[PDB]
């Protein structure tokens, strides 16, 4: 069912995965790629970006979350025009910056396992340069509710992508919109769905209650038996929540 497509953003080749036509645009997390969203792409539809430096996209120097938001926004415009933007962790930071720069292209926001500030444990971030296996194991212990096939696969991916993982996490570590939400300057005017796995230790419940408190039209969904990787660990529950929200916002199903 899925297709891989390619577009050009200012000379940078960007790959995306796409399912059935739907105005939904997914943005993956650090050290990951569009394949993070396969369970959503096949059931809900839409497009998932491979950010530059990830998946089948070109490599290019990226020094901020804002720069990734530029690639994401251009890619959204070229594929779906306007969309519900779904971001996980780093991708949720990218989604927030995308909304702030280009609110017109966001029909709604889905903030998954993310935060207004994404400081990274120094034992992970500094541990990746010296003993990456230990750092990866620590990060993943905080990201999965259970070991098993998804955990093992992600562990191997991270071991294969340590350099990009460290670059991505360094961008997270510098990402901070917290006070701008707190002091009321940053306003999210679109419908928002905030999703977190009950066991998530990388971006815990309080990060998601923070969004829910500061965003007027937000709904919070905590998914039991999942941690940070909720869209992979509990995909059926995740999809049901997302589909209910898409109905609410009017992003119709368009079968056949
Ligand atoms: C790395 C870490 C220990 C640094 O902690 P720190 O030096 O206290 O600095 P922070 O800026 O994160 O936190 C300071 C305060 O802001 C709050 N805060 C930070 N990020 C927040 C967010 N996204 N939402 C709401 N509150 C937040 C904290 O709760 C804390 O409040 P407190 O003083 O009342 O406890 C901490 O951020 C952490 O444990 N993070 C989770 C693990 C991780 O590595 N996540 C990866 C994210 S990509
Ligand atoms: Cl991340």
Author numbering: 1 to 256
How did the manuscript describe this experimental structure?
This belongs to the α/β hydrolase 6 family and the X group of the ESTHER classification. AF-Est2 was tested against a range of p-nitrophenyl (pNP) esters and was shown to be active against small to medium acyl chain length esters (C2 to C8), which is consistent with its classification as an esterase rather than a lipase.
The structure has been isotropically refined to a resolution of 1.4 Å with a final Rfree of 17.5. The structure reveals, as expected, a canonical α/β hydrolase fold core domain (Asp1-Arg117 and Asp176-His254), and a cap domain (Leu118-Phe175) formed by helices α5-α8. The active site is located at the interface of the core and the cap domains with the conserved catalytic triad composed of Ser89, His228 and Asp200. The structure also contains two CoA molecules at full occupancy, several ordered PEG molecules and a single citrate molecule bound at a crystal contact. The AF-Est2 esterase structure has shown a novel binding mode for a CoA molecule which is located in a groove overlapping the active site of the enzyme where the pantetheine moiety is partially obstructing the alcohol binding pocket. There is an ion pair formed by the diphosphate moiety of the CoA and the guanidinium group of Arg117. The necessity of the CoA pantetheine group displacement for pNP ester hydrolysis was confirmed by incubation of the AF-Est2 with the disulfide inducing agent diamide which enforces the formation of a covalent bond between the thiol groups of CoA and Cys172. This oxidised enzyme shows no activity towards pNP-valerate demonstrating that this enzyme is inhibited by the formation of the disulfide.
